Write an enzyme that holds these catalytic residues in place. Structure first.
Site, mmCIF file in Angstrom:
data_model
loop_
_atom_site.group_PDB
_atom_site.id
_atom_site.type_symbol
_atom_site.label_atom_id
_atom_site.label_comp_id
_atom_site.label_asym_id
_atom_site.label_seq_id
_atom_site.Cartn_x
_atom_site.Cartn_y
_atom_site.Cartn_z
ATOM 1 N N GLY A 132 0.788 -1.219 0.000
ATOM 2 C CA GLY A 132 0.000 0.000 0.000
ATOM 3 C C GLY A 132 0.823 1.273 0.000
ATOM 4 O O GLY A 132 0.357 2.321 0.458
ATOM 5 N N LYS A 163 -0.575 2.510 -4.256
ATOM 6 C CA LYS A 163 -1.166 3.831 -4.449
ATOM 7 C C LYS A 163 -1.051 4.309 -5.894
ATOM 8 O O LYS A 163 -1.911 5.062 -6.368
ATOM 9 C CB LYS A 163 -0.503 4.845 -3.513
ATOM 10 N N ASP A 240 -5.992 9.059 2.935
ATOM 11 C CA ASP A 240 -5.283 10.053 2.125
ATOM 12 C C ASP A 240 -6.198 10.677 1.071
ATOM 13 O O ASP A 240 -5.851 10.772 -0.109
ATOM 14 C CB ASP A 240 -4.047 9.431 1.470
ATOM 15 N N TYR A 279 -7.162 7.128 10.288
ATOM 16 C CA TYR A 279 -6.556 5.820 10.502
ATOM 17 C C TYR A 279 -5.461 5.834 11.563
ATOM 18 O O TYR A 279 -4.748 4.836 11.711
ATOM 19 C CB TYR A 279 -5.996 5.281 9.183
ATOM 20 N N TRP A 334 -2.488 -1.957 10.483
ATOM 21 C CA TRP A 334 -1.686 -1.634 9.307
ATOM 22 C C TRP A 334 -0.418 -0.960 9.817
ATOM 23 O O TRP A 334 -0.449 0.207 10.220
ATOM 24 C CB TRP A 334 -2.485 -0.731 8.365
ATOM 25 N N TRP A 335 0.696 -1.685 9.800
ATOM 26 C CA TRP A 335 1.935 -1.213 10.409
ATOM 27 C C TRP A 335 2.860 -0.661 9.329
ATOM 28 O O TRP A 335 3.314 -1.404 8.452
ATOM 29 C CB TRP A 335 2.617 -2.339 11.185
HETATM 30 C C1 LIG Z 1 -2.777 4.230 5.861
HETATM 31 C C2 LIG Z 1 -1.482 4.689 5.247
HETATM 32 O O1 LIG Z 1 -0.385 4.440 5.732
HETATM 33 N N1 LIG Z 1 -1.614 5.424 4.062
HETATM 34 C C3 LIG Z 1 -0.414 5.905 3.385
HETATM 35 C C4 LIG Z 1 0.461 6.733 4.308
HETATM 36 N N2 LIG Z 1 0.042 7.946 4.525
HETATM 37 O O2 LIG Z 1 0.714 8.607 5.448
HETATM 38 C C5 LIG Z 1 0.824 9.909 5.044
HETATM 39 O O3 LIG Z 1 1.905 10.386 4.678
HETATM 40 N N3 LIG Z 1 -0.398 10.534 5.120
HETATM 41 C C6 LIG Z 1 -0.495 11.844 4.623
HETATM 42 C C7 LIG Z 1 0.568 12.738 4.836
HETATM 43 C C8 LIG Z 1 0.445 14.024 4.354
HETATM 44 C C9 LIG Z 1 -0.713 14.413 3.688
HETATM 45 C C10 LIG Z 1 -1.756 13.517 3.506
HETATM 46 C C11 LIG Z 1 -1.657 12.218 3.971
HETATM 47 O O4 LIG Z 1 1.465 6.208 5.068
HETATM 48 C C12 LIG Z 1 2.301 5.251 4.458
HETATM 49 C C13 LIG Z 1 3.752 5.763 4.581
HETATM 50 O O5 LIG Z 1 3.794 7.052 4.054
HETATM 51 C C14 LIG Z 1 1.934 5.142 2.953
HETATM 52 O O6 LIG Z 1 2.647 4.108 2.349
HETATM 53 C C15 LIG Z 1 0.442 4.721 2.886
HETATM 54 O O7 LIG Z 1 0.027 4.517 1.575
HETATM 55 C C1 LIG Z 2 8.076 12.480 -4.705
HETATM 56 C C2 LIG Z 2 6.616 12.315 -4.984
HETATM 57 C C3 LIG Z 2 5.859 12.073 -3.638
HETATM 58 O O1 LIG Z 2 6.131 12.723 -2.719
HETATM 59 N N1 LIG Z 2 4.876 11.060 -3.541
HETATM 60 C C4 LIG Z 2 4.138 10.788 -2.334
HETATM 61 N N2 LIG Z 2 2.845 11.336 -2.213
HETATM 62 C C5 LIG Z 2 2.109 11.134 -1.115
HETATM 63 N N3 LIG Z 2 0.720 11.693 -0.986
HETATM 64 C C6 LIG Z 2 0.099 12.390 -2.165
HETATM 65 C C7 LIG Z 2 -1.465 12.365 -2.005
HETATM 66 O O2 LIG Z 2 -1.888 12.923 -0.803
HETATM 67 C C8 LIG Z 2 -1.227 12.414 0.319
HETATM 68 C C9 LIG Z 2 0.327 12.511 0.189
HETATM 69 C C10 LIG Z 2 2.605 10.347 -0.023
HETATM 70 C C11 LIG Z 2 2.103 9.924 1.285
HETATM 71 C C12 LIG Z 2 2.853 9.201 2.031
HETATM 72 S S1 LIG Z 2 4.380 8.877 1.259
HETATM 73 C C13 LIG Z 2 3.924 9.826 -0.203
HETATM 74 N N4 LIG Z 2 4.692 10.029 -1.320
#
Ligand SMILES: CC(=O)N[C@H]1/C(=N/OC(=O)Nc2ccccc2)O[C@H](CO)[C@@H](O)[C@@H]1O
Ligand SMILES: *CCC(=O)Nc1nc(N2CCOCC2)c2ccsc2n1
Ligand SMILES: [Ca+2]
Length: 671
Positions: A132, A163, A240, A279, A334-335
């Site tokens: 994920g 994603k 997200d 979450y 979800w770790w």
């Molecule tokens: C539930 C979860 O962990 N969602 C994403 C995730 N989202 O965390 C965010 O960075 N959330 C977020 C941060 C800034 C703006 C919007 C969402 O955490 C993991 C590590 O980054 C990602 O791999 C996941 O896809």
């Molecule tokens: C270098 C490109 C990048 O930063 N990709 C990225 N996008 C994230 N999202 C975009 C959609 O909204 C939430 C933030 C993201 C989240 C966790 S790690 C990550 N990488």
């Protein structure tokens, strides 16, 4: 070392030979997947009708009637017995029989078996991996390899949700996969079934979902097409996202509609999972009532996912109790480790630790979000498998070593040496850090302190650092040429090169400490300066992803040590010989007339939160957050625009080599 460790194990210190002539009982009644594993192990041995008795079967099969009382009454439980006269492999259910053979396979060594009796079963019902993360989704070959890995370690869950898969998320989640991607997913499902793994296909529609009949029907049509490809478990992620998709009442209704009109209409659907928009604890609404709405409206059979107290966090007893109170059921954890999609210049190869080991009853499942490097993630995945199956006996360090010896037996020590110094994440927005280089840290910290304040360093600590650097170089060269796990080596090679250069730099800096005469010191100094430039080259040409490009290694202890020792000894040299050698530790081809070091990232030149480039480049834009020239003489002022302290202006390909300003800070150029 059995992994995961069984719930109950009795050994007799008394070995049996795998029967050359055996008599198989239950080959037609037992799980076909288990029987196939069994007959692979027995090939070359003769199947008679008067040899040693081997009985395989599930509770209910004629073959294991005699052992009914020994089979534990737990989902996926089993009973294993080896002694003088017979062998018994008996699961409570078909998956238990498969898991009985995965333990049987570890006991078999050099053709001998130990006289043993095992009763075993998992403490957590759903255990596995969720793909994920953001970034390059796992390749098809990587996923096939993962699914075999899960089966061997008794992980029963693979949740597919990259994603960046357009048919999983925005905007084409309404579209069926193209024929080629569909045939691959079909193969993944068949392979997952062969390894007793539930393939969970997730969908991420919440960013542009409309709460009307159209999108609801399209989501179900997509689920139906996945069902036709063999998928029997499904998930809906609402993480997200912003806007109307974040409505808890609507999310619950949609998943209850999926439950009643789909999961309850089919004969063979297993897991139905949802990931909430809130979450983790830190980002939940104290005023609002998002989680309590989900807990009350969602049907009880539907799982709810949760990452802990923060996006990146360890799972505690107080944190799991906090969430369960609100969602009215055990959380499906979800770790977010070892995922690195927010620190993509780092590999996270350290051990799995921090999660309370007495809360198995408080969680419905436990899945790890890995790195986009599939093989490198096997260290943590193997460890999570052990933790989730038998938390009470989870041994962090022993399981870390066992994982490494399984992933790369031909060079396990070399991989352990590399992984030990590639565990921390460096500073990040989540503030989540891991230990690194813990064995050598005491010597490093004593050596440097005695050095900076003019004391005397212990020669033992000095040789420890010499030993470390030498061993780092051995491991890098051996790992670079290892052909036992080629996918693994391809993933880590950029870091292995950077690893070796660090080691070589460390040796040259230590030679600068011993000193001797002035010319030898200068030779070592010039060699160090060249190694800095080589590490810059790698940092700019390898792993050029659009988030955290480059390659960072041994960042927590070793690199700080070398840089501060180099800076210190150069200072002592300039004081002693009245010189002016450069004491900076990171090579930078550009120059600024502050103590802030310029950084190069992709085609950007920025000041760390007047500039002279090493050449003339076409300009793209400048972004300051609170005038230009080509030769330093003639300038051409440029105006800025503004929003909330966001200054910017386009250069429109004008030649630029110099930048200035007087009354965060980035310059983008064309490459
Ligand atoms: C539930 C979860 O962990 N969602 C994403 C995730 N989202 O965390 C965010 O960075 N959330 C977020 C941060 C800034 C703006 C919007 C969402 O955490 C993991 C590590 O980054 C990602 O791999 C996941 O896809
Ligand atoms: C270098 C490109 C990048 O930063 N990709 C990225 N996008 C994230 N999202 C975009 C959609 O909204 C939430 C933030 C993201 C989240 C966790 S790690 C990550 N990488
Ligand atoms: Ca059966």
């Amino acid at each position: 070392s059995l992994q995961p460790p069984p719930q109950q194990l009795i050994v007799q210190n008394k070995t049996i030979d795998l029967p050359a002539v055996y008599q198989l009982n239950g080959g037609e009644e037992a799980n076909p997947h288990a029987v196939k594993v069994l007959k692979e192990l027995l090939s070359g041995k003769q199947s008679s009708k008067k040899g040693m008795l081997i009985s395989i079967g599930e509770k209910g099969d004629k073959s294991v009637r005699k052992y009914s009382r020994q089979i534990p009454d737990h989902k996926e439980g089993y009973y294993l017995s080896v002694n003088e006269k017979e062998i018994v492999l008996a699961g409570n259910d078909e998956r238990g029989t498969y898991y009985a053979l995965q333990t049987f396979a570890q006991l078999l060594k050099d053709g001998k078996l130990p006289e043993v009796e095992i009763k075993d079963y998992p403490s957590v019902r759903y255990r596995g991996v969720v793909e994920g993360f953001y970034g390059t989704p796992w390749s098809h070959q990587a996923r096939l390899s993962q699914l075999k890995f899960y089966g061997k370690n008794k992980m029963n869950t693979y949740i597919y949700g990259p994603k960046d898969d357009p048919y999983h998320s925005a905007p084409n989640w309404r579209l069926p996969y193209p024929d080629k991607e569909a045939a691959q997913l079909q193969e993944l499902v068949a392979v997952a079934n062969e390894n007793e793994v539930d393939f969970v296909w997730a969908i991420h529609p919440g960013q542009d979902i409309k709460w009307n009949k159209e999108d609801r029907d399209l989501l179900l049509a997509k689920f139906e097409k996945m069902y036709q490809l063999g998928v029997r478990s499904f998930a809906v992620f609402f993480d997200d996202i912003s806007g109307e998709g974040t409505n808890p009442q609507k999310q619950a209704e949609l998943l209850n509609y999926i439950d009643e009109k789909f999961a309850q209409v089919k004969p063979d659907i297993n897991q139905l999972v949802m990931c909430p928009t809130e979450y983790n604890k830190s980002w939940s609404n104290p005023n609002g009532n998002y989680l309590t709405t989900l807990g009350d409206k969602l049907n009880p059979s539907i799982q709810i996912m949760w990452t802990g107290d923060r996006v990146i966090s360890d799972i505690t007893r107080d944190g799991i109790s906090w969430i369960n109170e609100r969602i009215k059921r055990p959380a499906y954890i979800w770790w977010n480790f070892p995922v690195s999609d927010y620190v993509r210049d780092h590999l996270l190869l350290g051990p799995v630790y921090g999660n309370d080991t007495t809360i198995a009853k408080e969680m419905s499942g436990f899945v790890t979000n890995p790195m986009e490097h599939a093989e490198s993630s096997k260290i943590a995945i193997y460890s999570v498998a052990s933790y989730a199956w038998n938390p009470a006996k989870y041994d962090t360090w022993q399981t870390w070593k066992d994982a490494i010896r399984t992933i790369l037996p031909s060079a396990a020590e070399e991989l352990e040496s590399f992984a030990m110094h590639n565990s921390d994440l460096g500073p990040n927005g989540h503030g989540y850090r891991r230990e690194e280089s813990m064995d050598i840290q005491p010597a490093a910290e004593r050596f440097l302190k005695a050095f900076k304040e003019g004391k005397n360093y212990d020669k033992a600590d000095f040789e420890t650092l010499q030993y470390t650097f030498e061993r780092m170089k051995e491991s890098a060269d051996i790992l670079l040429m290892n052909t036992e796990n080629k996918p693994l080596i391809v993933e880590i090679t950029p870091w292995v090169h950077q690893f070796k250069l660090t080691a070589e730099m460390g040796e040259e800096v230590l030679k600068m400490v011993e000193g001797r005469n002035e010319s030898y010191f200068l030779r070592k100094y010039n060699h160090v300066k060249a190694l800095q430039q080589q590490m810059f080259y790698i940092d700019q040409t390898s792993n050029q992803n659009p988030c955290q490009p480059g390659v960072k290694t041994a960042t927590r202890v070793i690199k700080p040590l070398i840089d501060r020792t180099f800076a210190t000894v150069v200072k002592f040299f300039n004081q002693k010989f009245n010189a002016h050698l450069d004491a900076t530790t990171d090579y930078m081809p550009h120059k600024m007339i502050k103590n802030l070091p310029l950084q190069v990232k992709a085609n950007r030149v920025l000041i760390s939160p007047e500039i002279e480039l090493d050449a003339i480049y076409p300009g793209e834009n400048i972004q300051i957050n609170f005038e230009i020239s080509t030769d330093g003489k003639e300038w051409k002022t440029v105006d800025l625009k503004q929003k909330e302290s966001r200054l910017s202006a386009g250069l429109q390909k004008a030649p630029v080599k110099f930048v200035r300003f007087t009354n965060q800070f980035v310059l983008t150029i064309e490459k």
